[PDB]
Design a protein around this ligand. Sequence first.
Ligand code: HEM
Ligand SMILES: O=C1C[C@H]2CC[C@@H]1C2
Length: 405
Amino acid sequence: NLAPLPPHVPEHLVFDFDMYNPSNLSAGVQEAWAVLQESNVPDLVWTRCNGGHWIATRGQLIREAYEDYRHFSSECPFIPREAGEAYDFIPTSMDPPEQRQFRALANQVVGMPVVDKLENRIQELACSLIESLRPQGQCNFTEDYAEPFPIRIFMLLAGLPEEDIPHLKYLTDQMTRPDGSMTFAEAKEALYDYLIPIIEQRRQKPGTDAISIVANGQVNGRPITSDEAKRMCGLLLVGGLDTVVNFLSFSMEFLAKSPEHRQELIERPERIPAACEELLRRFSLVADGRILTSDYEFHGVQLKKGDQILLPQMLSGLDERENACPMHVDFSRQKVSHTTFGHGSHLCLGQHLARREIIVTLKEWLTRIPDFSIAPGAQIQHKSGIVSGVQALPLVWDPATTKAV
Ligand code: HEM
Ligand SMILES: O=C1C[C@H]2CC[C@@H]1C2
């Protein structure tokens, strides 16, 4: 299902990439997207899939488009258009200068100072989850750790019941990795239906949770509205539930397959921070975009007003111009270049939280379960979309080689 090429699109620029079902998926999701960076592909291409849109394939263009909010607007950041149109999360669907006030608030909730406050729980949950797994010599890492670890920390931050997870998780998944089961507007509506009562409850009787803080915040000297709070929280959920979860699986899948990388972190712990950035570069997983506010010539390609462009945050760091031997994991790279957390005014607020969750996990897992591998004959399946994921990750290990702490 390729849409007919618009008249302004030169046929030499066509490359029919399906962000939702890329051809090389078997090889891995990063590898499947990396095809866009082969010598045969122009830097800026047009795909006829998903209704037709542009894709920037290079770190250079991605960074520029991100910096340029005057031309590339956040207003409609998701492909396909219907999804981008229904998308109304704050601060993500807004441009500066309006964005700024909303960002300052979300920052109060997810920011540095919150991490510093939650540090002991993160460490506590990580240790508890691992210890519980250790003696079993086998898990489903995605269901057993990747999911509960980050999610329970989020549920804690948000003051939401663990009971709600499954429901919330599903709706979130529909938004980033649509199934066909529900349209974006539908999913969005369901999420909002969930939240509305909660926001109401917390405007009345405020707590110390993230929702209470957002529901009663000030923006541009006045109180946030119910609709604004709902739009903020909807974003917080997607970030809390769907990002860190997916990243850990990719990282763990890699560690499971590379004994020498595990060893390196075991002996040279001082390398964990560097390694964490290198995994962020190598297993980058977000791809959203922007919308042209007007006709604009960019790197000699004529973009028309209303055109959408995918600016895959995932691709910057896989770009050979940015990182020599990009598909290779090297914890001792002199410079790890990526835009895994974005670039420009929308730079990820939760990055501090995400790095803490990653680093604790590496340190704590390796401490207790230094030697593990993928279950014999398990075929690991990746999934692509706005946020790419791993379907399941069966791990196996010998209990006898683990260490209780
Ligand atoms: C590995 C984990 C994560 C990745 C790769 C990631 C990636 C991103 C990216 C690429 C953007 C910008 C999108 C754009 O420019 O359209 C973003 C923005 C955002 N992320 Fe993160 N994120 C992660 C974790 C989180 C977490 C855990 C939270 C909160 C619980 C979160 C909250 C946010 C918020 C609030 C923004 C919007 C900032 C603004 O618009 O000013 N993120 N993230
Ligand atoms: O809406 C979105 C922007 C990035 C963070 C969550 C999801 C991907």
